[PDB]
Design a protein around this nucleic acid. Structure first.
Ligand SMILES: [Zn+2]
Lengths: 24, 130, 71, 108, 177, 148, 114, 46
RNA sequence: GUUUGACCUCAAAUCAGGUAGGAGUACCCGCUGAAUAUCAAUAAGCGGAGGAAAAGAAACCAACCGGGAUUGCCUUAGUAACGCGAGUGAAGCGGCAAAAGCUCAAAUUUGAAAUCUGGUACCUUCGGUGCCCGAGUUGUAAUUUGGAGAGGG
RNA sequence: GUUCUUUGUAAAGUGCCUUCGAAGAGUCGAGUUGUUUGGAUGCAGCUCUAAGUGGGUGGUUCCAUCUAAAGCUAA
RNA sequence: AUGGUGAA
């Protein structure tokens, strides 16, 4: 679903990167 | 038990209930035709066969239409609101049978009913009244 | 050592411990154990008057009806 | 150690329950029409047996809906698929016979 | 709906925003009693998907349990013991730290006429549902009981004690087989 | 000192523009329970063709349904919602959809104009007065988005 | 022997109280002697007290006529478990969707012969 | 472009059916004589 | 405003309407639990329900021309498997008993929070109505629970 | 069976055409430590922590079957 | 071994 993908991208941009993700 | 002995010794008396015989006897309570023809002397399967009906649809385990006519004979035994009628009459007077024109009536077709619904309602009104 | 107990009167109320070894007074629960089969029987329901439990069975038989006979 | 002394008692109780159901369910046969099923486990695949309920495709091919079929005494199972034309045809024929033999009283 | 956004945000549990929210909320709760009445849930999406509804009859309680009988089971038992007149339906995790773990439990009062007349919720008013957490009938209790389908739960599909009794009994018919 | 996604609140519309927005919103107060009940009773008595009503949209779920459809023109967001996660993403959603948004202090103040004790958000879709709404939107943009 | 309840039903509160006082005085006088009449007067006292209590209870019921939440004394004594176990109306409550489904497809009565 | 779907229902372009249902319920109540119109309430205020 | 209001939070009242302990305990559910393999998920102990309890409509069983809620019996079977030693020990398929499917989260009623608790006066009183009070917008009703489902013709 | 009511431009179903078409995260999962099983599974303290034509269960390139992390329900 | 009793 396009709406679900958009919501996921919005949440990804809002939440930033996790502490373990920041290591990348 | 202690309670049973106390109850037996007590003068209150037992609340006797005799219903063993009533377990064997069951009266039909879902059909008037069957009740008149049903015979409690025979079993469920025997009664169904006597009436001419099937008591089981699947192959039963273990070894094994004078009445159905009455059941078949037993098989042979909405309008519009006043405001709805007035609304239909208004549109009929304003547009007659012009369904397409009636559809676009902004101040009489308050509810945007389809052409099919409008024509069906008008036909029902005509049949009921004229 | 022991004294009369208000709940049971079994004369098993410890003076120093201020508790009854038989019925468990003042504990809300009544002391009882499975291994004490004879003890349970001695204090099982029905050993007393059963002022209210007696009429429950009779009342149920009538469906807990209320009112009076129509004569 | 349990001894089935009640075997006769259990049978009598089951018969009494069936009689009570018949008294309440006199007009109906107490059973829902079941489809024919071919078993897995080739040791038993040769044996055909009754199933839980007819598939949605079979009910549709029988000229009735599952919701209406249930009220007429037809078991419906939406979990079973269809992969055999012979079984589908047999189930359709059984449903057609059931529809042609059932009598429904008016709701009026 | 917004609840999808809430669920997606809650998916990234280790986000710096959720970290700040959790560390603020745990500190705020640290100044309150172990068990206290909650005005409203802090995770509306989780409660809503768990069956909670904002109507007269529902109650939200927050309980703190020592870290290290699961923690959720202990919380449910404690709230049921304290809320004797209410029935525990479900609970969800809301916070954790190095010392304590916090869970939120939603309760429904069967005495309120709103629940009694609610066709979708009056089922809990039956006496057989008394103290669901006590018998492990809650979601956490059932999960801890191993109740599920498949080979992975054959020995605990329905009753770990029942199977032992069944396999230890000696069934003898009137006519020996 | 908090993550940038937080502390976007505490920067809010100024007193003058906030008062102007509240005055504009008060015009479209939804018919309260008593007013709607009495109007419906009057209509029934008269019965015993209609213009579309205009009112503010305040339900968070309803507003979010209107948001992302690009129908909402101006949305007010309370900065004191206890479940902050309910409103952390709303400004970003509005920015992505290009819908102007304004953070107004006090959920109670936001709800006082919609006949409710509290209201997390409020949004306008239809208007009576379009020039006033456009001017208010431009002022809010220039005073909030271009500054913070 | 003794007083008849069916005669005392229509007596007023003051008359019943006076009769009870007279019976109590008679019992006190007879106690000094220490005699079946003592049993008769004792039974009459109980009958008068029961009649007075019955009158008072019906008066209390009348004053609470029809209004909700009557005193627990007048409420049903069936059992603790029956006050729970939601009443017939609550149990019969059904969602609109289920009612619509039942109306659309009610359970039909049928037989299978032809 | 908007992300949603399910094009606009007719009710959004038509007067609410709930309002009509409430009006007809009030009309039924008035017919049964259990509701007094506000105009009659003004007279009864005496 | 050297003030007056909206809420939110926290306390109290011999406040109004409610429920909780405990008893019994053969069966049910959970926790704990002896005399590294064995007596053993036994004995004992604690907590929680009913006339039954639990479970229950698959992130199932199978590798077949497939079956289709849970539960009990025979069979599978003293087999597979394990501890290969004394010993423990399943489950699918098959036949039988009885069969019933459903409810929320999820996409706008926004052209009308349409929902519900309580108070008051009546009536046809296990409830209904007019009015008021409060909850609800941080979501109460209808519409959908994957068998798809929804706006229209 | 008997008797009063319905109504309101009210609620559903059938076949066709058309435009859309959501899915339980400190959860699955791996690690380790206690526990149960004749099952190697499950239960349980804790570091980490998953994706949406995705995920779970089974074998010779993968093919077969469902959609867990909510709940109710007589026999 | 389990659960209790009294005893400084
Ligand atoms: Zn004692």
């Amino acid at each position: 679903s396009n709406r679900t993908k958009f919501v996921r991208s919005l949440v990804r941009e809002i939440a930033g990167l996790s502490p373990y993700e920041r290591r990348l | 038990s202690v309670r049973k002995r106390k109850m037996n010794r007590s003068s209150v008396g037992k609340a006797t209930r005799r219903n063993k015989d009533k377990q064997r006897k069951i009266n039909i309570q879902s059909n008037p035709i069957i009740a008149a023809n049903w015979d409690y002397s025979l079993t469920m399967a025997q009664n169904y066969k006597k009436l001419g009906l099937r008591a089981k649809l699947q192959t039963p385990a273990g070894g094994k239409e004078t009445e159905v006519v009455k059941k078949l004979e037993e098989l042979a035994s909405r309008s519009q609101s006043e405001r709805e009628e007035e609304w239909l009459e208004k549109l009929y007077k304003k547009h007659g049978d012009d369904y397409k024109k009636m559809f676009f009536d902004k101040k009489l077709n308050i509810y945007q009913q389809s052409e099919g619904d409008l024509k069906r309602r008008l036909l029902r009104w005509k049949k009921r009244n004229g | 050592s022991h004294t009369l107990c208000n709940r049971c009167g079994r004369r098993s109320f410890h003076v120093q411990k201020k508790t009854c070894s038989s019925c468990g007074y003042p504990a809300a629960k009544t002391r009882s154990y499975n291994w004490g089969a004879k003890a349970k029987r001695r204090h099982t329901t029905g050993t007393g008057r059963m002022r209210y439990l007696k009429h429950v069975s009779r009342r149920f038989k009538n469906g807990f009806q209320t009112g009076s006979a129509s004569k | 150690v349990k001894v089935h002394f009640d075997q006769a008692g259990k049978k009598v109780s089951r018969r009494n329950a069936r009689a009570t159901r018949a008294a309440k369910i006199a007009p109906r046969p107490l059973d829902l029409l079941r489809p024919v099923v071919r078993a897995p486990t080739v040791k038993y695949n040769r044996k055909v047996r009754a199933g839980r309920g007819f598939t949605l495709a079979e009910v549709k091919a029988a000229g009735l809906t599952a919701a209406y079929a249930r009220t007429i005494g037809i078991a419906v199972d939406h979990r079973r698929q269809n992969r055999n034309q012979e079984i589908f045809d047999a189930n359709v024929q059984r449903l057609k016979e059931y529809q042609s033999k059932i009598i429904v009283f008016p709701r009026n | 709906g917004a609840y999808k956004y809430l669920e997606e945000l809650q998916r990234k549990k280790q986000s710096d925003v959720l970290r700040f929210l959790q560390r603020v909320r745990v500190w705020e709760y640290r100044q309150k009693n172990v068990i206290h009445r909650a005005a409203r849930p802090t995770r509306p999406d989780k409660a809503r998907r768990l069956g909670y509804k904002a109507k007269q009859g529902f109650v939200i309680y927050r309980v703190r349990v020592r870290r290290g009988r699961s923690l959720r089971a202990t919380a449910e038992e404690r709230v049921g013991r304290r809320a004797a007149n209410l029935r525990v339906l479900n609970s969800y995790w809301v916070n954790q730290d190095s010392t304590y773990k916090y869970f939120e439990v939603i309760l429904v009062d069967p005495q309120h006429k709103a629940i009694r007349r609610d066709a979708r919720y009056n089922w809990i008013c039956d006496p057989v549902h008394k103290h669901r957490e006590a018998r492990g009938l809650t979601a956490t209790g059932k999960k801890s009981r191993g109740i599920n389908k498949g080979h992975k739960f054959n020995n605990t599909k329905a009753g770990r004690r029942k199977t032992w009794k069944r396999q230890n009994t000696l069934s003898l018919w009137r006519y020996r087989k | 000192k908090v993550p940038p996604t937080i502390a976007q609140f505490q920067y809010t519309l100024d007193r003058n523009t906030a008062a102007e927005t509240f005055k504009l919103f008060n015009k479209y107060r939804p018919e309260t329970a008593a007013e709607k009940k009495e109007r419906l009773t009057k209509e029934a008595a008269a019965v015993a063709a209609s213009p579309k009503p205009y009112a503010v949209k305040y339900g968070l779920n309803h507003v979010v349904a209107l948001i992302e459809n690009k129908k909402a023109k101006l949305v007010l967001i309370a900065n004191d919602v206890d479940p902050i996660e309910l409103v952390v993403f709303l400004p970003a959603l509005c920015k992505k959809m290009g819908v102007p948004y304004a953070i107004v202090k006090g959920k109670a103040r936001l709800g006082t104009l919609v006949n409710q004790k509290t209201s997390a958000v409020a949004a306008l879709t239809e208007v009576r007065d379009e020039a006033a709404l456009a001017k208010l939107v431009s002022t809010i943009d220039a005073n909030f988005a271009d500054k913070y | 022997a003794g007083v008849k309840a069916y005669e005392l039903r229509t007596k007023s509160k003051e008359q019943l109280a006076s009769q009870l006082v007279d019976l109590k005085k008679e019992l006190a006088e007879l106690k000094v002697q220490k005699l079946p009449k003592i049993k008769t007067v004792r039974k009459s006292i109980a009958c008068v007290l029961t009649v007075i209590n019955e009158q008072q209870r019906e008066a209390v019921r009348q004053l609470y006529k029809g209004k909700k939440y009557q005193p627990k004394d007048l409420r049903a004594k069936k059992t603790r478990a029956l006050r729970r176990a939601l009443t017939k109306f609550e149990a019969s409550q059904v969602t609109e969707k289920q009612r619509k489904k039942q109306i659309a497809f009610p359970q039909r009565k049928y037989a299978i012969k032809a | 472009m908007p992300l949603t779907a399910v094009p606009e229902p007719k009710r959004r372009f038509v007067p609410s059916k709930n309002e009509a249902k409430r009006v007809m319920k009030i009309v039924r109540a008035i017919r049964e004589g259990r509701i007094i119109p506000p105009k009659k309430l003004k007279e009864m205020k005496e």
